[PDB]
RNA sequence: AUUGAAGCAAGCUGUCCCUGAUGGUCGUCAUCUACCUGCCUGGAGUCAUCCGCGGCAUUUAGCCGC
């Protein structure tokens, strides 16, 4: 049985879940620069707040996927490429999955002299003398970054084509609360007051201002294309394998990435789809004895790259 | 049921779908270097501002209708003329139908040697002086390619008359929404600040300010200029087969391709029609069966040309 | 403003990738209190039978219960 049938009778697949404070009523939204919280006039007049952004959700998916401590991939996803930078001590200085681009590090591809770089040059010289073959730069990525593919990349460097070439993000998800309403909150630093003077050396006592929000309902949005996979048609198992990955990754972080800031500890009540209609999602621990099974698939296919994890060692 | 029968009077037909993201309230415009602030004083006195232009809109009408990996029309498609370049190693990089210049390219029509320039000459060397019939110059552009027909070209060389011959558009579209609010948002480099603040390396922290839209309603307009069709009057099933694709290619870019940038999806709610009100437009599942009917009794016709397939020589 | 196309500046280039969060004790004392007349004179009144004409009758073809 496979559900990747069902998926691609369908144009896109979306996600909903509803979620709420464990303790209390109140929570910390994400706090951009020069604007503090993010909200806005919703349609219907009612107040809205971005709760956390798209582009940091994708590094939490990421961060749930992945063992910065082991350096290597959770049980399941235990054999997927990764490249890893190392430091001229031969010591883990970063790898893609924690870096941000995962392929446009300053780290990765740079310094003195990088295969990465060599490895680029020859694969996407299909693109840099003709027209953009998406299959061809989607595997491409396959072999090397299999992270990549699902939240794209921008090589805007000189030598790879300017920059012309690009892979937009195969899924999006973002959080969401509406008719929200403030609470203020501030405090005070409050120790030796006339013992310690000049509030500027660290002494004294300074006040400060806090505000939190509270709303009736928290949404999370997953919106997974699921025609920009079958655009890239690169092989049905592969397409198997890249949506039990997604499904995987967001059913984790469900569980375990529930509690975005000190202040923001939320519980997911249910999730639900809203496209396709009446499909059922599978359990998170009939994913994790699938999915190994699916990547041996996909390495008997030889669409990996050899070896998987490829090392490169880093100086400025 | 037959269109131009019905309509048989009026001069155009203005359409209008609209349409809403799919998850959330925000969306985010196109960026002009040139022209600056895209938002700009309306007469009913409140904001308004061009989701999409023509231009662009014209570009993603053409995209619809073909398969850049298979390098084919779809099933209902398949039959209509294309015009392929090869390349130097003999597989064919780029076609008229994805590119919107078409005819007057640096590709065709201009290069070291120029066979397609002489099959324009030939006929040139018919129309000469005097007003140009737009007849034969329509039949001209469906012997080479109809989409040229239904979205316009002209030819800029001073052999080709320097431009004194020009078809104008057939289909005009352009997307707009109504009292918008604006909105903002940002984010930063956030990994490895430390080693080093300086920005030009891309090590240290940048801030990035950004900002998207809301607006209670997003709408499509597109009109048709009938009279122009039937103007052209090249057989009665010709001119069902041109309405059929043009409305062909509105029933796909209202069920594909709404999502102008990866940012923000999009899906209508309604589509309607305005000038000749009463009629009801036809169904995809049913203009999907009507169509192949049509290519293959145009075909009997053969007004076409009858290579249905066309190769021309590219250099540099 | 019209017979012999202003329905006529018409084809003209801006794209995707980015995590802003770790922790700050606004807290202690304070008396609101005392005196004062609401009240006062004033007509709502007056006469008008619960019987039943229902049912039987489309009914003046004709009567009959509680």
Redesign the interface.
């Known amino acids: 049985m496979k559900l990747e049938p069902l998926l691609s009778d369908v144009?896109?697949l979306?996600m909903e879940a509803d979620l709420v404070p464990v303790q209390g009523t109140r929570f910390q939204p994400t706090g951009?620069?020069?604007?503090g919280a993010?909200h806005?006039?919703?349609?219907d007049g009612r107040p809205?707040l971005?709760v956390e952004?798209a582009?940091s959700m994708a590094?939490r998916l990421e961060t749930v996927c992945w063992d910065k401590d082991a350096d290597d991939w959770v049980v399941p996803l235990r054999g997927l490429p990764v490249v890893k930078v190392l430091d001229k001590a031969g010591k883990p200085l970063?790898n893609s999955v924690?870096?941000?681009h995962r392929l446009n590090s300053?780290?990765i591809l740079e310094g003195k002299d990088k295969t990465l770089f060599d490895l680029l040059k020859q694969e996407l010289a299909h693109m840099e003398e003709?027209?953009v073959d998406?299959?061809k730069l989607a595997e491409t990525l396959l072999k090397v970054d299999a992270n990549a593919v699902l939240h794209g990349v921008f090589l805007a460097k000189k030598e790879l084509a300017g920059g012309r070439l690009r892979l937009?993000?195969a899924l999006?998800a973002?959080i969401?609360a509406e008719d929200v309403r403030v609470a203020s909150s501030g405090g005070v630093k409050n120790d030796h007051v006339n013992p310690s003077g000049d509030t500027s050396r660290g002494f004294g006592n300074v006040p400060f201002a806090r505000d939190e929000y509270v709303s009736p309902r928290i949404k999370a949005?997953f919106?997974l294309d699921l025609?920009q996979i079958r655009?890239f048609?690169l092989g049905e198992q592969v397409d198997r394998l890249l949506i039990a990955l997604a499904l995987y990754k967001v059913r984790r972080f469900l569980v375990h990435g529930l509690r975005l800031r000190t202040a923001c500890d939320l519980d997911c009540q249910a999730l639900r789809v809203t496209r396709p209609e009446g499909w059922e999602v599978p359990e998170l621990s009939e994913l994790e004895a699938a999915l190994p099974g699916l990547i041996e698939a996909v390495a008997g296919e030889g669409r990996f790259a050899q070896p998987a994890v490829t090392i490169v060692t880093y100086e400025k």
Not at 32 to 35: A, Q, V
Not at 40 to 43: A, F, S
């Open positions: 144009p896109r979306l951009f620069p020069d604007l993010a806005y006039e919703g349609p809205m971005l952004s582009q590094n970063t924690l870096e941000a300053p780290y003709g027209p998406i299959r937009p993000r999006s973002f969401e949005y919106n025609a655009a048609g």
